[PDB]
Amino acid sequence: MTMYIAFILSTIFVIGFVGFSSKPSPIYGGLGLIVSGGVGCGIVLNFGGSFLGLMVFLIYLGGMLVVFGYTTAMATEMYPEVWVSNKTVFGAFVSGLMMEFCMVYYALKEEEVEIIFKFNGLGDWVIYDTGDSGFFSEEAMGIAALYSYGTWLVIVTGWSLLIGVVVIMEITRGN
Amino acid sequence: PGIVELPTLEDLKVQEVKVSSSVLKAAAHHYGAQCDKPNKEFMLCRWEEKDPRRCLEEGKLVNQCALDFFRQIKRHCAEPFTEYWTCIDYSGLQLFRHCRKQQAKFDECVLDKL
Amino acid sequence: MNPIIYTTLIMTVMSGTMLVMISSHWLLIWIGFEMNLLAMIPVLMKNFNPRATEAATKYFLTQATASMMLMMAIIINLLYSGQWTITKMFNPVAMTMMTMALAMKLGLSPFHFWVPEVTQGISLQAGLLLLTWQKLAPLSVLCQISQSINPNLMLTMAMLSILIGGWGGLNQTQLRKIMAYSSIAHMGWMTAVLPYNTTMTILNLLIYITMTLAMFMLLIHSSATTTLSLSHTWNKMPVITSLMMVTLLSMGGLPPLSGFMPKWMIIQEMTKNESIIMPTLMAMTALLNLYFYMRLAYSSSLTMFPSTNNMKMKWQFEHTKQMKLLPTMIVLSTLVLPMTPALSSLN
Amino acid sequence: MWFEILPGIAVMAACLFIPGMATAHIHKFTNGGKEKRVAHFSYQWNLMERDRRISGVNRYHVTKGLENID
Amino acid sequence: PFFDVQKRLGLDLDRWMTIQSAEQPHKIPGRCHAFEKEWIECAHGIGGIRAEKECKIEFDDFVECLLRQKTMKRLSAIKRQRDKLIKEGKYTPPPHHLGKEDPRP
Amino acid sequence: MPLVYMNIIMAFAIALAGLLMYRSHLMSSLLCLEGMMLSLFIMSTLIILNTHFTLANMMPIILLVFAACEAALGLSLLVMVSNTYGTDYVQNLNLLQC
Amino acid sequence: MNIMLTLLTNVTLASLLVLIAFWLPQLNAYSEKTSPYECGFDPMGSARLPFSMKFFLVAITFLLFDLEIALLLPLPWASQTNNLKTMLTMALFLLILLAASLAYEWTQKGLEWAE
Amino acid sequence: GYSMFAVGIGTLLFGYWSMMKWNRERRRLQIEDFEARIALMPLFQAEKDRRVLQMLRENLEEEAIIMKDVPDWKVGESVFHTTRWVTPMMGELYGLRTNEEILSATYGFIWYT
Amino acid sequence: MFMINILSLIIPILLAVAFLTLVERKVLGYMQLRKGPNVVGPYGLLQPIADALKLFTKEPLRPATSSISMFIIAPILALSLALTMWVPLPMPYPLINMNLGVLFMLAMSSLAVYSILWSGWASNSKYALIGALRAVAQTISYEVTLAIILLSVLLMNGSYTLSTLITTQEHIWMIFTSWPLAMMWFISTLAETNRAPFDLTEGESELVSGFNVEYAAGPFAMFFMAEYANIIMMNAFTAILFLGASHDPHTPELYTINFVLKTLALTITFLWIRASYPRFRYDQLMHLLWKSFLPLTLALCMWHISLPIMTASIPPQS
Amino acid sequence: AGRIASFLKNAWAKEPVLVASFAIGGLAIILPSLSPYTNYAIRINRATPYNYPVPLRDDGNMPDVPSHPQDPQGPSLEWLKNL
């Protein structure tokens, strides 16, 4: 109930997801994914995850820049489609919006199990921590533990990245 | 699953230490040097019992020790302590490094008087 | 492709599978799957042509969707129980999603459509790898989480896989698609017995892998990808066609050949529980795979098809590259039934 | 000039002086004149909340000294 | 299927991150450290089949700590009854609840 | 579960449905894959922050890494497809049948 | 709260500037005035036609190298651990891996633009 | 050529030495501040325990007043089988208070910039 | 009281941008043996006001082929982001105090490129498209190296908080410790702001007006203001990062004067560089960033991880 | 030993940037294993008291544990002040 900020941000997250999942044109799909990344960063920030939200926003900004370049190169047409320029795209968009609104009404006015379990609402503030200690950020400590506890993870991740470079070069070699 | 036992409100009353964070920080080192025994007893109770309801008397003793410490500080070095904690309080991060003269005066007073 | 790069990619595929097999953490299992897929994509595209590119694209789309569902199931399981260890899978919705993702990775029906297409679009070596090594990781995970499986869903998918493999294989003249449909049916057999005994799953997997390796190696030795090109092999090397005929008979499950051993064992295991109708249906359905194996044997070994004049020139030259493991693979594919009790060593 | 470029530079300098000075003065005006408290960690936030609770007027910057302990 | 290479060699490749009750940096505890510790100690060595029955109480407490379903149900019941009482006008709510409380440090 | 958890799960389901229902462009489906990865990142981060699982805080970053790999892989394939046909339509990937 | 207010203020100021720009002056729009600009001559094709990217491989490599930034950002906090030898070994391992990937792409003509 | 490289290297070395001295001093200052926090911690813990217990007791009395109308409600009944102390969920401490206090208790630290 | 702070931040920044236009024109003139604006207003002091009044009383154009929504959205995004990038700067106190201010600047800077991208695409003209693709190439050129340089420099700060940089450089400027990183960072900020010799998105000689060729009047003025605000902001970030002014807690005005003077010096250096050099080819910028800056930056990142551990000089605030 | 000298000269004459990068990277790799102050950094990291030191219960058989913070027993930071 308290300012509904998390609920509003998650609803905008779902709206951006519906925006790019109706697939109007990769330009507008990239715009919707950027909007979703921003609101997801906000959602994670509201839970105390500053570093993770900022990181995911930066990564998806770079990814969508590359996707924009590739859309200009290889995924264009004479008339790019928007959400109101085509009946299939508009129908999918409106169906997604109505599905989100119906699910919200179902879970808010009632307390029923959609798929997994039930939910009454009350705002996400209830399940917080009231933990009072620390001269450090716990998320920062957990993420920094990658270089002392996660040696195996670092090894596999670095090997995967090097292999990915080799792999993309092999795939695009052609001939 | 059974009911939860809670202390009465009257059991939770104790004389309060009502000095701000700058005042507490300005006297933190001497406070930890003087009131060490009750504080350590309370912390051992807290970490062994794992229940705040079983270490109330130790908390009251900690408050009493802090009150006695601050009463002595008021009795002997009111003014140097006031200057030192005002200096500490002006800072936005409440830094020790920016006020060493006032700390030196307060240290000299407490060393000579007590 | 550079031989060094090819060796590195093959080693990365195997390392991803091994990471899946040795991990205790769900994140490390997912990472093993990701690494395996990343290294596997270029191996499918080694001989570059539009068909190979199409096969690689279809394979990537299928496996990426499967991995997304896998990660979502893991995260749901973590939400309902803060556990990362691969165990009895405390949530049923997560378990359903996990089962569907693993079935999509394996190519079980009804997520079976990509297997014939990818197999037909790639070379015979890539097909050998795809149909032998790529089954190990999902089957290992399924064996580890078998106690929490829902038998209805897995048995439905296994029966569908057997039926669809037989029916689809009945219609093929291309050898790679025949092998793919055979693989679908054998995966159905492997997953039918998984909720009851994982040792039987391992035994069926080993025998199937041996027979498939012998089949693919014989097909590489005689450069045939169609029925009509395989019908020429008798006029160049009859020994290869005779060994192929015996191997096909073994893959058909006829006693006293080795391919009879898994089905037999599986049937027995299913009758140790109640489970009477399903094994009968499975055997009667495997008769279809036997039928199209027999048709291949008719085309290649039991009758002689007309040949061409230029074949005379091929008589003057010998096979340069030799497969060192082909004879042992053929022997293990055919004459292994009398050593059946050694399956005790699998558990 | 070359010294006739200076007036525009002075105007830019005067414009750029405003943000920092305004922020400092506004911080001092709304925090008792003593350099608004910084809370990068939950411990400092707890300190501020305790100060606000014991201030008696719901303002953390109102500091209670030794005169508040009888 | 599972080749326990870590157990055979004593390597600890990934076991450090499997559970929340296992040696966090700076000794930061999980929100449900005690519940998970109790469930793990209950279920250790007896197998999954027996643990699913004989450690059901500890697991239920752990899940309640994780998701807090019953706590929200109880809070919602209390709030609903209080709202009905005030709407009827018989509630007569206290000053501390309304923000007029005498705060303590 | 709170409403936010249901919203994130719904976002994942929407992205999965968008991926499973192709229109014409392969790029749009790749975008749906990236959206699924983002939803998984958000959901895992929220769970890990809520339960104060300190060592699990590095897990979402790892996810992102492989997401990038998967994103790169897809793009590479798209390039080849375009070079074959002058377009990225999934209709052209029909040389192989069942 | 303050950051949301700042974002709202900045966006509102920009939107008001656009509104003033579009509603204050006199508008005389006709077909020739709003036609696309191509230096006085009509364009041959459309601007929505495919535009070749000569540096696509570098773009994919940029996607891959961007995640190593996320991997290496927590290093200031990682430098505060008790076991500094393992942390330094792993950080140098990651940086050496990134340098090796750059060297591999460099030597195989991967940084050269397509012609 | 040589002179410029030498001058740059000397500048780098002088900066390195100065930064080493300053960083060691800053480490000592951080240790001193951390020790002050350690000295102050037990009193904060005692007051936090008293605050939590007082809020819980007030909630218990208010719930005992509110929920006496219903037939089958045990007042103060726990939701856990175990009888050991469980840290409050903070929806239990601030559940009957105004939304301003709820906002300050939930998002107060995160939104303070 | 906070809204007053926001206004007292954002209005003076706009005035500073307006008069930076005049200062750049006059500096270029006097380096080109001419005077520059000295007619309208004494010493051209009324020239920015006249330019703004002319631009906002001029008809704005909506191209027939353009996508109108993105066309209008792009300048709003540009100006709002440029104004927002100023809020975490400590001068010596920030408007918004963030634990990770540096990462916030990084994220908002990498978001700012979509203004150029979307304006160029939504213009639906060939020159605008070429400019937008050049922007894509420029970002791909500079982003990774910029991030690694930032991390390498901040390895001596101990955190990502911008205020700590003041205490880190209490005795010596950070440039005396990382002058190679300072040089590479300066070139990278020249590239990040689309400034000469890296002004390729506009490309006046090659692309007429490039990405903003279809924009006129107020929407064009907004892009101009965003660009110059980014200039001043990036130079202020450089001044804070590498030339740390001494802060007296009882006299912040001295720090403010010092920091503003350093920022003005760096901005004048930007104008000097524009007046001094020719323009790069946009593949040559990529080659410079990926073949010269990146290997040296990786080596220096290794060195700046190893050095504090080697010398027992690790900063505080884990 | 003679051909590599010519190789180094040619690299310095054609690609000085790569020469400097490799030299800096090699120094950064090998120097930390030869420095005596790395262990000083480890000790400084270990001497930072992030958490509260929980006291031990006296069983009467721990002469190495101080009974008070100012007692002569316990660890010393006197090495840190001279650094």
Ligand SMILES: CCCCCCCCCCCCCCCCC[C@@H](O)O[C@H](CO[C@H](O)CCCCCCCCCCCCCCC)COP(=O)(O)OCC[N+](C)(C)C
């Ligand atoms: C039999 C065949 C052998 C060769 C094939 C091996 C294939 C795997 C590749 C590498 C082997 C993995 C073994 C290393 C596992 C890491 C964990 C172990 O080594 O302990 C670490 C020891 O760290 C050491 O530094 C070893 C790690 C250094 C690894 C060097 C890189 C080698 C990888 C090269 C191959 C990988 C792919 C190719 C990339 C180039 C951490 O110890 P410590 O920190 O005290 O205590 C942690 C517990 N705390 C947190 C409570 C304090």
Ligand SMILES: CCCCCCCCCCCCCCCCC[C@@H](O)O[C@H](CO[C@H](O)CCCCCCCCCCCCCCC)COP(=O)(O)OCC[N+](C)(C)C
């Ligand atoms: C720096 C940023 C912040 C600045 C703060 C101030 C913000 C200013 C607001 C932004 C707009 C600036 C433009 C001002 C010019 C007026 C534009 C418009 O509002 O006027 C007319 C709007 O009027 C409409 O055309 C119809 C008339 C009113 C419609 C009736 C609606 C019902 C309202 C009830 C009215 C009864 C009396 C109201 C007083 C109580 C439009 O006419 P039009 O020619 O096309 O557009 C060009 C205007 N020209 C002629 C100057 C070039």
Ligand SMILES: CCCCCCCC/C=C/CCCCCCCC(=O)OC[C@H](COP(=O)(O)OCCN)OC(=O)CCCCCCC/C=C/CCCCCCCC
């Ligand atoms: C006192 C002695 C100093 C000793 C210093 C250490 C050894 C120094 C020499 C080692 C190698 C020096 C550079 C390599 C030899 C010369 C360069 C060369 O091979 O050819 C140049 C050629 C580039 O020119 P082109 O782009 O092809 O030009 C096209 C237009 N004509 O180089 C290449 O082809 C490949 C370059 C690979 C670069 C390596 C990638 C980055 C790695 C450095 C980052 C940090 C490394 C630190 C880790 C290593 C630690 C030992």
Ligand SMILES: CCCCCCCC/C=C\CCCCCCCC(=O)O[C@H](COC(=O)CCCCCCC/C=C/CCCCCCCC)COP(=O)(O)OCCN
């Ligand atoms: C004791 C242990 C210490 C460890 C060693 C540390 C010392 C290392 C010494 C070397 C550091 C040098 C850093 C320089 C980084 C890049 C230098 C470079 O080589 O770049 C050039 C080019 O770089 C440039 O010239 C930049 C182009 C853009 C110019 C824009 C204007 C010029 C700058 C004006 C002054 C800027 C002042 C910088 C700092 C400002 C204050 C912050 C590469 O291009 P080419 O010469 O064509 O060769 C490549 C093909 N073989």
